[PDB]
Amino acid sequence: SIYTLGIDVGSTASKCIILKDGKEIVAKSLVAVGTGTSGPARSISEVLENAHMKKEDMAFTLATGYGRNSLEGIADKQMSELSCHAMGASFIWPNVHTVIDIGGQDVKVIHVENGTMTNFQMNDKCAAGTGRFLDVMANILEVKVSDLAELGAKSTKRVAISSTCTVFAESEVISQLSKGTDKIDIIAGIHRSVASRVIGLANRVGIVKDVVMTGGVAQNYGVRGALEEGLGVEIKTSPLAQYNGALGAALYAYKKAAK
Amino acid sequence: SIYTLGIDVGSTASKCIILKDGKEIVAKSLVAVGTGTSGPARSISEVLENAHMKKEDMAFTLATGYGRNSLEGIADKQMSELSCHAMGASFIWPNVHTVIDIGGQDVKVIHVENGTMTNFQMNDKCAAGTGRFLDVMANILEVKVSDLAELGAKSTKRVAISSTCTVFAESEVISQLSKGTDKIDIIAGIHRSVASRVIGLANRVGIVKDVVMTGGVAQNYGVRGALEEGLGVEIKTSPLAQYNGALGAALYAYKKAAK
Numbered sequence: 001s002i003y004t005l006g007i008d009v010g011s012t013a014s015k016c017i018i019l020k021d022g023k024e025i026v027a028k029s030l031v032a033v034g035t036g037t038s039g040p041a042r043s044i045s046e047v048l049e050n051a052h053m054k055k056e057d058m059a060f061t062l063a064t065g066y067g068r069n070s071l072e073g074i075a076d077k078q079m080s081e082l083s084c085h086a087m088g089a090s091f092i093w094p095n096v097h098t099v100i101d102i103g104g105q106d107v108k109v110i111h112v113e114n115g116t117m118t119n120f121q122m123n124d125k126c127a128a129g130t131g132r133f134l135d136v137m138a139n140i141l142e143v144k145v146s147d148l149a150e151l152g153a154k155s156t157k158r159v160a161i162s163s164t165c166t167v168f169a170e171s172e173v174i175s176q177l178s179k180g181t182d183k184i185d186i187i188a189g190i191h192r193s194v195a196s197r198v199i200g201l202a203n204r205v206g207i208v209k210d211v212v213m214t215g216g217v218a219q220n221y222g223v224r225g226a227l228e229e230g231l232g233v234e235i236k237t238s239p240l241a242q243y244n245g246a247l248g249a250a251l252y253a254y255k256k257a258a259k
Numbered sequence: 260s261i262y263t264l265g266i267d268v269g270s271t272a273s274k275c276i277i278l279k280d281g282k283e284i285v286a287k288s289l290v291a292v293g294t295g296t297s298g299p300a301r302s303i304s305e306v307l308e309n310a311h312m313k314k315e316d317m318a319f320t321l322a323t324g325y326g327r328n329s330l331e332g333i334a335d336k337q338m339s340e341l342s343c344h345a346m347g348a349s350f351i352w353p354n355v356h357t358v359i360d361i362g363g364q365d366v367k368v369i370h371v372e373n374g375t376m377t378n379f380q381m382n383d384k385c386a387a388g389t390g391r392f393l394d395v396m397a398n399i400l401e402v403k404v405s406d407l408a409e410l411g412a413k414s415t416k417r418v419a420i421s422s423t424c425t426v427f428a429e430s431e432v433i434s435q436l437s438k439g440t441d442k443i444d445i446i447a448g449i450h451r452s453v454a455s456r457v458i459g460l461a462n463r464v465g466i467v468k469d470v471v472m473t474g475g476v477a478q479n480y481g482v483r484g485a486l487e488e489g490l491g492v493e494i495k496t497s498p499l500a501q502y503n504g505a506l507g508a509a510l511y512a513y514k515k516a517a518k
């Protein structure tokens with residue numbers, strides 16, 4: 001009976017979630033964020049449509065993300081991206097305590113307790129370990145970022161990328177091609193390279209029980225598997241992975257719409 | 260009467276120096292890293308020719324640089340790049356105490372005392388502040404790395420690049436173009452951006468009196484000027500700037516050839 005709207009406006013995309021009584025997801029949406037493109041707005045329409053409801057049907061609207069204020073007038077209230085991820089993770093996995101969120105342009109590991117963000121470490125300046133790292137690599141390899149996972153899974157040889165930087169690592173990848181190294185192998189290498197950076201931030205926080213991966217890159221099971229190897233613990237993820245930030249907002253909305 | 264050979268084999272180029280009695284430069288050479296694995300070799304021939312002498316005439320040969328361990332057989336002893344720069348700087352500027360060396364793929368600030376490396380700070384992992392940063396920018400701007408200095412000198416408006424990263428700053432530059440911002444201005448901005456990183460390392464060491472800029476990027480007076488503004492002290496440089504590492508090797512050679 002009470003419908004709420006969670007809006008996660010990131011730097012790459014804008015995700016939306018609408019849930020009934022804060023217990024079930026009725027609809028979600030995702031729209032690329034282009035300059036001028038007005039995609040966060042579009043995504044809102046997208047959800048409302050998918051759900052067959054009007055903005056006036058939402059009890060409370062909560063926005064989060066990089067441009068969580070670009071639609072200030074839309075959201076009743078805005079909230080930290082760390083908070084929503086913690087809240088959302090908790091809705092999907094009750095025993096979460098550690099949340100690894102990789103999105104374009106940034107990474108962040110969050111320690112969660114009672115759907116809240118206890119502590120966290122995040123990278124906002126280095127393109128390394130971000131989905132942007134994976135883009136720059138998929139381009140040189142001439143492959144689709146959403147294929148990397150599938151390809152790297154075929155690797156038979158370990159190929160390391162000693163360069164920590166995206167720029168230097170780019171040359172490495174180019175050079176590994178000059179040596180006739182297979183792409184499948186270079187990819188699995190790029191994945192461990194990303195895992196390595198995440199693991200780097202990860203340790204300043206500590207991997208607690210029931211680790212979950214969130215964000216768009218979450219889909220890349222190549223990357224996630226590289227993470228399980230590094231941290232040596234199960235890394236969980238679900239289809240809703242990239243809609244976590246939004247899901248968190250919707251949960252905080254339904255909460256604000258009860259107090 | 261005693262001729263020595265200094266060979267600085269970098270990642271970008273291979274420089275060579277030959278001096279008589281460790282007091283005067285008789286000849287120098289510079290050869291890129293074209294595909295072949297004989298550019299360092301080629302440069303040696305180049306110098307010997309320019310000088311009109313043969314490898315035998317060289318009393319002692321000392322190699323330095325990224326591929327130092329590659330001239331084992333050609334050279335007689337190898338030495339730290341920090342040491343040669345300090346030694347070489349001292350030969351060019353007696354009162355040096357601080358040496359800023361920007362080359363492709365790395366930056367490093369050296370404190371010098373009696374032709375020796377007292378302390379130093381260096382960047383080897385981040386492409387930011389390196390000549391590689393300038394490359395990635397010259398490409399997007401569609402200009403020649405050796406023109407940047409000349410162009411930026413015409414800027415009339417200050418345009419900042421808030422991004423510290425080469426990858427993110429790359430997009431910025433692209434975006435500053437979308438806003439119709441002049442290249443001349445974007446360049447001067449890129450220069451200060453580089454200066455900022457150098458100054459970053461610089462402070463962990465301390466700018467002492469008589470600062471000198473070394474390395475290929477040394478030529479870029481756009482960059483060097485950005486450095487004088489930041490540190491607020493004179494930054495010296497000479498034509499031999501990029502041959503400093505080699506010059507240092509030749510000086511250590513003539514020294515080894517006297518003890």
Ligand SMILES: Nc1ncnc2c1ncn2[C@@H]1O[C@H](COP(=O)(O)OP(=O)(O)O)[C@@H](O)[C@H]1O
Nearest residue numbers: 010011012013103104131145146215216217219
């Ligand atoms: N199928 C896929 N496989 C791999 N990566 C993907 C896939 N779909 C999206 N991604 C990526 O995951 C990231 C998700 O970004 P996201 O978290 O939505 O961005 P932001 O934090 O800016 O909102 C991007 O780098 C995007 O390209």
Ligand SMILES: Nc1ncnc2c1ncn2[C@@H]1O[C@H](COP(=O)(O)OP(=O)(O)O)[C@@H](O)[C@H]1O
Nearest residue numbers: 269270271362363390404405474475476478479
């Ligand atoms: N005329 C020039 N103007 C600006 N930059 C230059 C010029 N000539 C060379 N450079 C650059 O200066 C740097 C010199 O690199 P160098 O110190 O020789 O490399 P390495 O440290 O790998 O041996 C490179 O980034 C190169 O492109």
Ligand code: SF4
Nearest residue numbers: 126127165385424425
């Ligand atoms: S290490 Fe590379 S990817 Fe990271 S901030 Fe530096 S230039 Fe950017």
